Design an enzyme around this catalytic site. Structure first.
Site, PDB file in Angstrom:
ATOM      1  N   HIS A 204      12.244  19.051  14.706  1.00  0.00           N
ATOM      2  CA  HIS A 204      11.385  19.711  13.212  1.00  0.00           C
ATOM      3  C   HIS A 204      10.495  19.272  12.865  1.00  0.00           C
ATOM      4  O   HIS A 204       9.790  18.586  12.663  1.00  0.00           O
ATOM      5  CB  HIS A 204      12.977  19.418  12.535  1.00  0.00           C
ATOM      6  CG  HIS A 204      12.554  20.023  11.107  1.00  0.00           C
ATOM      7  ND1 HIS A 204      11.023  20.120  10.008  1.00  0.00           N
ATOM      8  CD2 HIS A 204      13.200  21.379  10.753  1.00  0.00           C
ATOM      9  CE1 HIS A 204      11.832  21.166   9.256  1.00  0.00           C
ATOM     10  NE2 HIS A 204      12.631  21.974   9.689  1.00  0.00           N
TER      11      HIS A 204
ATOM     12  N   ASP B 164       8.375  19.963   9.955  1.00  0.00           N
ATOM     13  CA  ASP B 164       8.450  18.880   9.004  1.00  0.00           C
ATOM     14  C   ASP B 164       9.145  17.165   9.118  1.00  0.00           C
ATOM     15  O   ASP B 164       8.304  16.013   8.667  1.00  0.00           O
ATOM     16  CB  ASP B 164       9.184  18.950   7.177  1.00  0.00           C
ATOM     17  CG  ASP B 164       9.186  20.490   6.980  1.00  0.00           C
ATOM     18  OD1 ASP B 164       8.057  20.836   7.395  1.00  0.00           O
ATOM     19  OD2 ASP B 164      10.475  20.815   6.774  1.00  0.00           O
ATOM     20  N   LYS B 165       9.910  16.865   9.801  1.00  0.00           N
ATOM     21  CA  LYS B 165      10.225  15.300  10.248  1.00  0.00           C
ATOM     22  C   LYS B 165       8.666  14.947  11.142  1.00  0.00           C
ATOM     23  O   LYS B 165       9.066  14.222  10.923  1.00  0.00           O
ATOM     24  CB  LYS B 165      11.838  15.692  10.779  1.00  0.00           C
ATOM     25  CG  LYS B 165      12.775  14.392   9.740  1.00  0.00           C
ATOM     26  CD  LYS B 165      12.479  14.793   8.604  1.00  0.00           C
ATOM     27  CE  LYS B 165      13.481  14.220   7.809  1.00  0.00           C
ATOM     28  NZ  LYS B 165      12.526  13.568   7.726  1.00  0.00           N
TER      29      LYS B 165
ATOM     30  N   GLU C  94      -0.375  11.917   3.925  1.00  0.00           N
ATOM     31  CA  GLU C  94       0.238  12.995   4.298  1.00  0.00           C
ATOM     32  C   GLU C  94      -0.313  13.589   5.638  1.00  0.00           C
ATOM     33  O   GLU C  94      -1.113  13.011   6.283  1.00  0.00           O
ATOM     34  CB  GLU C  94       0.257  14.012   3.352  1.00  0.00           C
ATOM     35  CG  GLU C  94      -0.181  13.305   1.864  1.00  0.00           C
ATOM     36  CD  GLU C  94       1.278  13.417   1.232  1.00  0.00           C
ATOM     37  OE1 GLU C  94       2.708  13.457   2.154  1.00  0.00           O
ATOM     38  OE2 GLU C  94       1.389  13.138  -0.182  1.00  0.00           O
TER      39      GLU C  94
ATOM     40  N   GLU D 257      -4.585   8.821   1.072  1.00  0.00           N
ATOM     41  CA  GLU D 257      -5.402   8.105   1.088  1.00  0.00           C
ATOM     42  C   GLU D 257      -4.720   6.597   1.490  1.00  0.00           C
ATOM     43  O   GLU D 257      -3.609   5.868   0.941  1.00  0.00           O
ATOM     44  CB  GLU D 257      -5.477   8.199  -0.313  1.00  0.00           C
ATOM     45  CG  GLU D 257      -6.372   9.387  -1.245  1.00  0.00           C
ATOM     46  CD  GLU D 257      -4.824  10.069  -1.374  1.00  0.00           C
ATOM     47  OE1 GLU D 257      -3.389   9.879  -1.910  1.00  0.00           O
ATOM     48  OE2 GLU D 257      -5.054  11.977  -1.319  1.00  0.00           O
TER      49      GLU D 257
ATOM     50  N   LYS E 236      18.262  22.131  13.647  1.00  0.00           N
ATOM     51  CA  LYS E 236      18.489  22.435  12.572  1.00  0.00           C
ATOM     52  C   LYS E 236      20.749  22.095  12.485  1.00  0.00           C
ATOM     53  O   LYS E 236      20.982  22.929  13.491  1.00  0.00           O
ATOM     54  CB  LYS E 236      17.967  23.301  11.202  1.00  0.00           C
ATOM     55  CG  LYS E 236      16.870  22.959  12.021  1.00  0.00           C
ATOM     56  CD  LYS E 236      16.019  24.447  10.571  1.00  0.00           C
ATOM     57  CE  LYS E 236      16.709  24.183   8.668  1.00  0.00           C
ATOM     58  NZ  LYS E 236      15.746  24.937   8.077  1.00  0.00           N
TER      59      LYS E 236
ATOM     60  N   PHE F 298      15.817  31.406  20.024  1.00  0.00           N
ATOM     61  CA  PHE F 298      14.988  29.932  19.081  1.00  0.00           C
ATOM     62  C   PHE F 298      14.175  29.407  20.785  1.00  0.00           C
ATOM     63  O   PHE F 298      14.253  28.188  20.787  1.00  0.00           O
ATOM     64  CB  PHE F 298      15.985  29.376  18.738  1.00  0.00           C
ATOM     65  CG  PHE F 298      15.156  28.103  17.751  1.00  0.00           C
ATOM     66  CD1 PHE F 298      14.153  28.181  17.969  1.00  0.00           C
ATOM     67  CD2 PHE F 298      16.070  27.281  16.923  1.00  0.00           C
ATOM     68  CE1 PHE F 298      13.449  27.125  16.650  1.00  0.00           C
ATOM     69  CE2 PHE F 298      16.007  26.258  16.238  1.00  0.00           C
ATOM     70  CZ  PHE F 298      13.982  26.156  15.877  1.00  0.00           C
TER      71      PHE F 298
ATOM     72  N   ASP G  90       6.581  26.601  12.556  1.00  0.00           N
ATOM     73  CA  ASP G  90       7.341  26.886  10.926  1.00  0.00           C
ATOM     74  C   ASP G  90       5.923  25.660  11.257  1.00  0.00           C
ATOM     75  O   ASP G  90       6.166  25.077  11.443  1.00  0.00           O
ATOM     76  CB  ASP G  90       8.516  26.782  11.135  1.00  0.00           C
ATOM     77  CG  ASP G  90       8.544  26.403   9.568  1.00  0.00           C
ATOM     78  OD1 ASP G  90       8.180  27.216   8.192  1.00  0.00           O
ATOM     79  OD2 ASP G  90       9.328  25.785   8.990  1.00  0.00           O
ATOM     80  N   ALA G  91       5.520  25.938  10.228  1.00  0.00           N
ATOM     81  CA  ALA G  91       4.380  24.621   9.519  1.00  0.00           C
ATOM     82  C   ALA G  91       5.239  23.737   8.961  1.00  0.00           C
ATOM     83  O   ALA G  91       6.323  23.874   8.278  1.00  0.00           O
ATOM     84  CB  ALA G  91       3.907  24.995   8.992  1.00  0.00           C
TER      85      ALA G  91
ATOM     86  N   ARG H  10       8.936  17.404   2.696  1.00  0.00           N
ATOM     87  CA  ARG H  10       9.458  18.850   2.943  1.00  0.00           C
ATOM     88  C   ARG H  10      11.210  18.660   3.109  1.00  0.00           C
ATOM     89  O   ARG H  10      11.823  19.723   3.099  1.00  0.00           O
ATOM     90  CB  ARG H  10       8.752  19.799   3.016  1.00  0.00           C
ATOM     91  CG  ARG H  10       7.712  20.779   3.022  1.00  0.00           C
ATOM     92  CD  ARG H  10       7.997  21.164   1.141  1.00  0.00           C
ATOM     93  NE  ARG H  10       8.503  22.380   1.779  1.00  0.00           N
ATOM     94  CZ  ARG H  10       7.523  23.512   2.134  1.00  0.00           C
ATOM     95  NH1 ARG H  10       6.112  23.287   1.671  1.00  0.00           N
ATOM     96  NH2 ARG H  10       8.185  24.355   2.429  1.00  0.00           N
ATOM     97  N   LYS H  11      11.373  17.771   3.592  1.00  0.00           N
ATOM     98  CA  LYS H  11      13.190  16.988   4.229  1.00  0.00           C
ATOM     99  C   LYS H  11      13.814  15.829   3.130  1.00  0.00           C
ATOM    100  O   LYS H  11      14.406  15.261   3.125  1.00  0.00           O
ATOM    101  CB  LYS H  11      13.195  16.873   5.170  1.00  0.00           C
ATOM    102  CG  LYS H  11      12.720  18.263   6.111  1.00  0.00           C
ATOM    103  CD  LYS H  11      13.511  19.261   5.751  1.00  0.00           C
ATOM    104  CE  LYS H  11      13.499  20.140   6.123  1.00  0.00           C
ATOM    105  NZ  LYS H  11      12.567  21.041   5.301  1.00  0.00           N
TER     106      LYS H  11
ATOM    107  N   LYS I  96       4.572   6.128   2.029  1.00  0.00           N
ATOM    108  CA  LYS I  96       3.680   5.409   0.787  1.00  0.00           C
ATOM    109  C   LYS I  96       4.174   4.493   1.557  1.00  0.00           C
ATOM    110  O   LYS I  96       5.655   3.485   1.817  1.00  0.00           O
ATOM    111  CB  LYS I  96       4.974   6.246   0.371  1.00  0.00           C
ATOM    112  CG  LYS I  96       4.363   7.308  -0.436  1.00  0.00           C
ATOM    113  CD  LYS I  96       5.616   8.038  -1.451  1.00  0.00           C
ATOM    114  CE  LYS I  96       4.993   9.567  -1.658  1.00  0.00           C
ATOM    115  NZ  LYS I  96       6.136   9.662  -2.672  1.00  0.00           N
TER     116      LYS I  96
ATOM    117  N   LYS J 240       4.360   2.806  -4.011  1.00  0.00           N
ATOM    118  CA  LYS J 240       4.904   3.979  -4.466  1.00  0.00           C
ATOM    119  C   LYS J 240       6.507   4.038  -4.527  1.00  0.00           C
ATOM    120  O   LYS J 240       6.754   3.802  -4.190  1.00  0.00           O
ATOM    121  CB  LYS J 240       4.583   5.095  -3.798  1.00  0.00           C
ATOM    122  CG  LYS J 240       2.650   5.415  -3.098  1.00  0.00           C
ATOM    123  CD  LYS J 240       2.232   3.978  -3.311  1.00  0.00           C
ATOM    124  CE  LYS J 240       0.489   5.032  -2.750  1.00  0.00           C
ATOM    125  NZ  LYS J 240      -0.506   3.701  -2.481  1.00  0.00           N
TER     126      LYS J 240
ATOM    127  N   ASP K  68       7.862   6.262  -6.070  1.00  0.00           N
ATOM    128  CA  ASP K  68       9.093   6.885  -5.332  1.00  0.00           C
ATOM    129  C   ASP K  68       9.653   6.506  -4.194  1.00  0.00           C
ATOM    130  O   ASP K  68      11.153   7.617  -3.579  1.00  0.00           O
ATOM    131  CB  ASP K  68       8.394   8.033  -4.721  1.00  0.00           C
ATOM    132  CG  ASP K  68       7.806   8.763  -5.535  1.00  0.00           C
ATOM    133  OD1 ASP K  68       8.247   9.180  -6.339  1.00  0.00           O
ATOM    134  OD2 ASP K  68       6.556  10.087  -5.521  1.00  0.00           O
TER     135      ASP K  68
END
Ligand SMILES: O=c1c(-c2ccc(O)cc2)c(Nc2cc[nH]n2)[nH]c2c(-c3ccccc3)c(-c3ccccc3)nn12
Ligand SMILES: O=c1c(-c2ccc(O)cc2)c(Nc2cc[nH]n2)[nH]c2c(-c3ccccc3)c(-c3ccccc3)nn12
Ligand SMILES: C[S@@+](CC[C@H](N)C(=O)[O-])C[C@H]1O[C@@H](n2cnc3c(N)ncnc32)[C@H](O)[C@@H]1O
Ligand SMILES: C[S@@+](CC[C@H](N)C(=O)[O-])C[C@H]1O[C@@H](n2cnc3c(N)ncnc32)[C@H](O)[C@@H]1O
Ligand SMILES: [Cl-]
Ligand SMILES: [Cl-]
Ligand SMILES: [Cl-]
Ligand SMILES: [Cl-]
EC number: 2.5.1.6
Lengths: 381, 381
Positions: free
Chosen positions: B15, B17-18, B43, B56, B167, B236, B244-245, B250-251, B271, B275, B277
């Site tokens: 996928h 994003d993954k 990123e 960074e 998905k 598909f 799809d970008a 985003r997941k 990260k 971080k 997060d």
């Protein structure tokens, strides 16, 4: 006993992720102004000197991406190299293709508009809480308003050392009230904001307390024990994309309920109505707010889910936290009798071809400005 | 009565994003192999023919980004233009700078490791539920396992028409049980997976039911009323970044609890431990799971929050859904006596300089593989 702390955050218009959301929605709006049926999936990436658009757009519009991007950055306030980013001189790169024909054929080609399929699978939630008039958690409302106040004082020139990149965070002590929640006091506030090289830390911290916090947060919530972390990093001259890369859809909790309710993971910005990540989350907010403003509950969470190519939701679920005399089964019947959550009907009810999206892309999509999803539906039951 | 439907989704290794999450963590791991104290905020963006790294990194490592990116894409399985993406021939672009010196000075420079500041503000949650042995919601576990099964049958050649982008989505009917939740049945399953140009829809749908769903979901949960949406888009063939970008982070709901519990908005991949997060969400999972496996509750949600530059959390909060005989106040005292949620202590307890991150970046970060945050702490009280 019966109390707890809860924290939410927000970010300003020049936060690098929010820059991306705003640019993505500026692109969407530009397309919709010319082609109300544009298919748009526009991601934005921002780093030092660069805005990149990546994604998929099929549209009859002729859009000047250079102008649209640069005007959005100008509006945010990044207009000089001294601020770390300048709309006049940054690079704008475009990697945009048509929508996949395989998606198009499975979602919308040769389909009646009301019966268009969801543009993707996924799950979405709507939430409302009676703790504020706008039916939003106080933590997130206050965090958004602190960022808005910073932008106001930057733009009116009274704190001219401010720059556009900011973050805020508010911790509130809540009491339980029969499944609902009641805010008692503000326990902690964080504010970090990019600033010029000349202003000193004590001037900034004094201004942030006296001209920002006191101008936003009612004094009844603040006491001698409230903790303030104002410019806690000590120095924030480098900011915007130069300090931290930004991407569209990396502030989804800021965009929604500040951690309250629930979230299904989908981003809003850069997407037309056929992307249920946006349209069905907006509709679910509308349902939740309609239930609370209609007196059926004080606090409510609605889940919906979809499959790509299928118009009706696969599931609709409701949880009222014990704040209704009606069962959730009864509330679901009321929702089914009053709402049609096919994307091709949501678009009509919420007017989702209208180019109003850039306005949604900072300060949260909910609880503000009487957008269609914020105007409760009168329920018949 | 007392039942509700709840839906969660997952995505496969290919996928888009993954892909980005995995590449971001491959970059992190490459740095950590050489410099355990690397500061990494990487990123990844993916579109047709392109992987872009933006962010960074300050590190003593010498990393070959071309090799690291391409090897990650090879592992995922995108190795030919016929599949829509090829590690051998794609573009790899790099827009990486040093960490902002303003951040570095406010977070970690000239600080004792245990007293390093949080790398950012923010809020994070940990969740655990006794409904499965791994203390995760059944909806998300099943959705992940369906994607893993697709990858298995692709890699072993038994379904050679499969491609890496997939998905899945699982809707379960739950019953209430004294604040906890009990899964009853699987109501709906969605599977969409990229495929070659030769296989027909009926062959795919039959295989997805018989070789994927039946190999994953216990028959006791499936009945003649369960609804199946298998290849619901109808076609598909175009997939991966070409369809799809993708972007890192985003997941975030797939990465965590599938919509259960709560989420503070931060992404994990790319990260290092400073971080919060990532590190504080991992620690909060560890706390939640420790409380459930220690017999103190059946279901629990923990919130923590931070300010940039400040080591101790600003707030720690617990909600046990009514599933403990102890009050949440008492549970918080237990947590405070047994855990230290400064990032510079979390790193030691959870071994967060170790280069294991790429393994976290598909199939969820929680509930799998006995990572340190999945090994409960024995609690003293
Ligand atoms: O409804 C409640 C109640 C509650 C409300 C009214 C009542 O009469 C009875 C109980 C509650 N009570 C308490 C008491 C001591 N601790 N908790 N705590 C919470 C949380 C929460 C709190 C702390 C950390 C994490 C999540 C949440 C939530 C918030 C965001 C997302 C998901 C759940 N809801 N919630
Ligand atoms: O605890 C509960 C309970 C519950 C559990 C045990 C008890 O003894 C009493 C009540 C519950 N009960 C019911 C019954 C009919 N509808 N709901 N529904 C829910 C949801 C939820 C459901 C539908 C849509 C949306 C959220 C959630 C949740 C899930 C994810 C994130 C946040 C909250 N929790 N939850
Ligand atoms: C702290 S940066 C995230 C970590 C960063 N990527 C790194 O390389 O360490 C996240 C956000 O915090 C804010 N920020 C950037 N520089 C900051 C500073 N010096 N002090 C406080 N906040 C800062 C900006 O809003 C930025 O988008
Ligand atoms: C449907 S695409 C999102 C919408 C897309 N950006 C557009 O331009 O309409 C989201 C995800 O669904 C999957 N997907 C892509 N093409 C698909 C297709 N033809 N059928 C089903 N799912 C598809 C991929 O996993 C992709 O990352
Ligand atoms: Cl951020
Ligand atoms: Cl300056
Ligand atoms: Cl997606
Ligand atoms: Cl093919």
């Amino acid at each position: 006993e019966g109390t707890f702390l809860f924290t939410s955050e927000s970010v300003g218009e020049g936060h690098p992720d929010k820059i991306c959301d705003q640019i993505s929605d500026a692109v969407l709006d530009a397309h919709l102004q010319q082609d109300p049926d544009a298919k748009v999936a526009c991601e934005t990436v921002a780093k030092t000197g660069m805005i990149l658009l990546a994604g998929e757009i099929t549209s009859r519009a002729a859009v000047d991406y250079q102008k649209v991007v640069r005007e959005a950055v100008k509006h945010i306030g990044y207009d000089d190299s001294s601020k770390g980013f300048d709309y006049k001189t940054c690079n704008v790169l475009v990697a945009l293709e048509q929508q996949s024909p395989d998606i198009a054929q499975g979602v919308h080609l040769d389909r009646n508009e009301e019966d268009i399929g969801a543009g993707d699978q996924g799950l979405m939630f709507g939430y409302a809480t009676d703790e504020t008039e706008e039916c939003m958690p106080l933590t997130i409302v206050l965090a958004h308003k602190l960022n808005a106040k910073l932008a106001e004082l930057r733009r009116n020139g009274t704190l001219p050392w401010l720059r556009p990149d900011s973050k805020t965070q508010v911790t509130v002590q809540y009491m339980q009230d029969r499944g609902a929640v009641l805010p008692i006091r503000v326990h902690t506030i964080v504010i970090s904001v990019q600033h010029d090289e000349e202003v000193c830390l004590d001037e900034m911290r004094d201004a942030l307390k006296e001209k920002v916090i006191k101008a936003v947060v009612p004094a009844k919530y603040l006491d001698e024990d409230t903790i303030y972390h104002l410019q806690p990093s000590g120095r924030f001259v480098i900011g915007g994309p130069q300090g931290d890369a930004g991407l569209t859809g990396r502030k989804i909790i800021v965009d929604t309920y500040g951690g309250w309710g629930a979230h299904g993971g989908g981003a809003f910005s850069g997407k037309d109505y056929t992307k249920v990540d946006r349209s069905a989350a907006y509709a679910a907010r509308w349902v939740a707010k309609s239930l609370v403003k209609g007196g059926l509950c004080r606090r409510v969470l609605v889940q919906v889910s979809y499959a790509i190519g299928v118009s009706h939701p696969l599931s609709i679920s409701i949880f009222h936290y014990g704040t209704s005399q009606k069962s959730e089964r009864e509330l679901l019947e009321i929702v089914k009798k009053n709402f049609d959550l096919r994307p091709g009907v949501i678009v009509r009810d919420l007017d989702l071809k209208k180019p109003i999206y850039q306005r949604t892309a900072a300060y949260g999509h909910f609880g503000r400005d009487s957008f269609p999803w914020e105007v409760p539906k009168k329920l018949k039951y």
